[model samples]
Target: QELILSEENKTNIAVLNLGTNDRRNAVLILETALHLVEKYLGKIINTSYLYETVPEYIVNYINELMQNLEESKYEENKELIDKCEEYETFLKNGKVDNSILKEVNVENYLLECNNIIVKNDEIMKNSYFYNLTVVVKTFVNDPLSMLVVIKYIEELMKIIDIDILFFNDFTIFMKNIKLEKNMIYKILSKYIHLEPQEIINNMVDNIEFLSIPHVYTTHRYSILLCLNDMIPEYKHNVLNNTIRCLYNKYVSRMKEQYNINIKENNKRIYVLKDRISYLKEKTNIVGILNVNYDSFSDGGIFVEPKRAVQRMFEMINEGASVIDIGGESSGPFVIPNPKISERDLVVPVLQLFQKEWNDIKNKIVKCDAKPIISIDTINYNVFKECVDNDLVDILNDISACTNNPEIIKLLKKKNKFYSVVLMHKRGNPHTMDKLTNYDNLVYDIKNYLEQRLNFLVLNGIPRYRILFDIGLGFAKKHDQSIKLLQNIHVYDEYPLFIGYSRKRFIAHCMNHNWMFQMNYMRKDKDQLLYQKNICGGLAIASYSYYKKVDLIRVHDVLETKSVLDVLTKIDQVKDPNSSSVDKLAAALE
Candidate 1:
């Protein structure tokens, strides 16, 4: 009785009704109840500490899945199965997690039933493990029943106050929960720098590419792609090279399908060597000299023949293997040539260069090979004048020789050695921007190039004398331009030339730069300001070199040369113990 308070009835925990004044303590009482409930729930649930051995359990799980299936189906996909088997073997033999293992117990012991939950979907769907485990997609999708096992982890973490498991533990727990490849990626990506090499190797192994032969009309072709971006960087090259090698091995198959045996030697050379050379060597640079005042970059700078000669030699000295001269501006919004006829615009320039060609061309010091002179023009009169007089060695036509049969006739009749750069553009500068939309940018561009190639080859121009250009600014928007720049390898069968020098897409990319934005804000139209974003041009040039592009057409040859030089140095020194170290070192010294 004495234990009860005199002011209130507190004996034996009596239940009492609260008045309006008691509302003040209501919040405190509720908060106490909530915390007590949480504490009690924490005591009820128990979770298994993440397994310390990853490879043992993971490899065992994979073997179990494989054993549950017939060997004939597995053998049918033996290549991919071998990759998975090797991946499992690599994990077992190479390395296991030796880091300090930590444990946190909470929620449920759901992860302990990994084997049963993992094959649940396989049991429910009755799908063969061989087919289900071929790639990341199948392995991930079929065993998602374990998601329920791990889903309670989030709540358990709050109650038990546990940090996420280490890589090895998470990797094992992922197998336990029958998690997908992306789930493993999500957990392991947090510590990418320290991610196990086995995980990376196996993840790449999980990516599969199978060639499916498609019969389209009279031709037999194969469809191949990475299928998904679930692979490693190095594996991409391996797969790409494998595809190229296979393509090269079965050249006669393609020729037979095409019914092309006219230029057998040329076709053989193209299929065997020319097509794959871009992947083997560094890309060449083509220096640009614009001879019109309205040309996009360095337009009026080289209008004078004397200044043009000087710039050409400077480009050669700076490591440009080719010189591309243009008379008119093909820029999106460039002022169209008005007073000067296309002939007068280019003829005099070509004549002057021809007069000085022998005198100054041999005086070149940087490149051992003679630099090929190329003319970029859309007019047949200009092309014929240049080719008929033997004034240029190459013709870069953005029109794809569609509107002008005269130019093609001239090229066919010319007995001299020359190359033609055929480019893809929907329409001329006045209307190209409106035609920028496409259902598939790369695919459409490739189809367009193939059609042009076939037309040129059938018209008597040898395939060996043809190069392709994915006209960057001609009819493309900013995003389209970048897409072509990055995916130049799509047309790897032919020599590719990319011209992104000081184009509007580059200027738009520079919008984030303070100076560029400031100039934009001022509405500045200075050509010099427009041409100052050489860094953006260099970025694409570097990308081009990495993709092993055949030729890069640029306004700033010296800057592009420096970018290539740095990249070459990086490549040379990448392998310190390489045999070419002595040769490279001697060259460097």
Candidate 2:
């Protein structure tokens, strides 16, 4: 009989035979340590300057004060001050005087800033939050820096009386959760005896295993084998033995089948297949047409079908190549009722646009280009209706194609010449803020898009007809949204559609003074003042253009068109494309 993995569905821990050297494992270790420090010891001396200088300064200053006050006429006060000098000095010369440093009294410092009432000075709290934020943000993209910081924190823990295992337990739990997900990549350096590429190829060739569980689990297993030293001592032997057995078993079978060594065919061959170019030479603007009156921006202005249809024409005239229409308000605070289906929200307004587009599309044949219509929704039923009725050219799914299996299946069934904008969002708008936690924000999003792409392809959706959108304000926090924009170049393979237009992140990125002014001016619900930072929005557009972003979604169509016109004119000298120039000139005209 086979041994049961577990009797009940309780959380179980598995030991992987990997060390910390593996990049993903290293990241988990670092993330765990950083999370622990930020959670437990964040409001203390986390900064390098404070950790190094404050302790020494406090010791020296207090000792000096005690020396001066020791001979005072006040006997009781003199006795209390004298005790301060008895505490050992840890700041001898530049070196960490460890002999005395280990024995230094920490009670004084603990009592000095422990209370929730008055608390440590504002500067102290500010510095702690700032340092933690820097560490958390940087570690995702740069795990090597996290290693150095982890070592420092580890050393600092030695000086404090806090148990190191307390943090380690949390770190282990974090690593387990990361391992469970199976999304992270493993470093190849640990598998020195085996051909790494062959191993990967073998695993990749196993479609069933690679699809269901292996795709997510393989990376964790690969990472675990490389972290032998880091795995718990008790579980190390069984884990290591199991890994070796599996590897040897696979190698033996491969050798027997091929009648040669596993390394025989590993000649580092590179294949160049038939390539299809989906890259756009210039970026285009996607205009927003909100039909919902409750949206965070541009709400209540264009709720009627006629008004919505009019805005679409205006946006096209203002130089929008793509018009994105949304019927329902999807924000962190907004709630949709049962009566308000996505079809109910979009159908009325979309029908008007569909009728108008059919009438004007032929007339625009001689003009620059007919604007592509996109529906911003995650509902499959809405998507199916729009596609079947020929209303939308692009389906911008905010749920990242994973919301419903039927959504992917329906899109595959249609298989028409329409673009699928796969957006990366953790949850629906309501729960987005709560789900901002990420292992590596950019990496996680990239992996998610790639996985979705694979799913789409496997289900018969053409790769050429796909676009990737890094869902900026959907579920992302201020820093996360800004970071995605800053590092948008990572998804250069697919046509990137960036839509940050007048979003909270724009206001978040604004300077303190600008935000204060905007806050006061926006109190009266002035549209212009509400979106006064059009220049700030344009700044991102400019960056996106330089990075060769395929599409930019924005609310200010006229201003964005002007900005793109200037950029296209500037770039014409280096890489002149008459098509873009003519379009720009026509828009200007």
Candidate 3:
């Protein structure tokens, strides 16, 4: 309780909260809460601990409830049979007291009646839940400035009243969670690192920490996540992979049913329109056609107009739904191109895309489906010419539309069915690397995107034609890119696009730097540059697909097709009455 004073500007803190309706979203909720507290207070040093807890009174209640049914001095189990059955039904799926089982008292014995033989902690154990706690960083500087942040930080600590709503399914959105340990969070702070594998192994290792009998497989997963966050050392990839799975299942369920609504803080309303061409498609592969000489992934490989056209055909045949033709390169070092060079490299390719897609629309040749041509540029003249010629379907811009409102004006003037991919980037490729200091990653990007969307929507570009790309490599550090990819689904309100192909994170995943791979281009026999990245890039594609992102821009097309195909196949395959499963199994056999 005395954790309220210390060295002025310290960032050591811990968060505590409970979950009743949904324990799993608690991870997301806590992250949200800490972000809020830190926003008003100080920076957060984050390491979360989720413990398996049960309410103290309820533990006693369940024990007596059970012992009463049995220890009725051995009379026909008395009226306890009826009582036990109801509480028994409650036992199976009731809002068991959200508490912790510190230790089991094995001394309380009760007689068995009607085949019901159970101890008190056995009952109490089933009631225990996956609880959450975490230490965060925050505080202040001197007198007045410190006072303002401190008071706000103190109030930010705990605003949640109903413990029911505290761990709610919708708790992640609200800013009212009770978090603590701000002022003296420095000296009192504790930090720990964890891996999911160890936690899986560490489960049930002690009867001390786990005094309850709760288990999770489905909601069994409910019991699982409390243990997910509060450990001294815990498995986070359990979250790394598991949260994505949560997005797939429960989060999807929430959206489909459009579950609960809060009338208080929600001031704006959006009448959503799903208008983009590929809005309905998941894992829509975007084939990247870099037409400049200094392109990062594939530079001179497609610089010739004929080769560019032919590569467009290849991308089309290999399952690219969108062909992103860019004359500029955002390589480690960018080659500045004049307007003439930019147009010469990119404009010819758009002409070919328009021609080929037109022919394919009339069934001139076999390809996947109707393909869209995306012009990647920041220059107004390049974007304007493409829009004027009616050549661009998606305006894939790194400028985030702030560079030229006239680019948006061009789209509005043309009144063509155009999609604009407004990416969140800092500065241009040259300066972007150094501008990596962000207040927060996903939220910061989302705010910029939202601001752009609001302005563009206000200016007559329908929200439906807008797609958000968080600009995976634009100005992000490698870990920031990875973190953004994991949570990019936060923009699900609008159609989404991801272009993580050959990004630095993929190379890091393969235990090599981009320089290592690029340096090996001359001496590397196996072409580890292309081989490592494409192989690693497909995994990002898989993650994007499962996240239900609308489109992915990639340097490799055929490989992406293979990955998305198997993913689509797996998603299509269902239960015993499955047709796709039967056909695939038959084909394999």
RMSD in Å for model 3:
22.5
C-alpha-based local distance difference test score of model 2: 0.48
Per-residue alpha-carbon lDDT of model 3 for 253-301, expressed as tens digits?
A: 5446755222111111111111113333466788888777423245333
Q: Global CA lDDT of candidate 3, please?
A: 0.51
RMSD of each: 29.6, 26.5, 22.5
What do the candidate models score in CA lDDT, each in turn? 0.47, 0.48, 0.51
In Å, residue 516's CA in model 2 sits off its true spot by 17
Clashes of 3: 28
Candidate that would win on lDDT = 3
* Model 1 CA lDDT for position 412: 39
Task: Give the Å error, residue 528, model 3.
Answer: 2.4
Candidate 1, RMSD to the unseen true structure: 29.6
lDDT tens digits, residues 491-573, model 1? 66566777887787887776533322121234445644654667778888888888878788987787889899999888886
What is residue 494's positional error in candidate 1, in angstroms? 2.1
Worst ten in a row by lDDT for model 3: 73-82
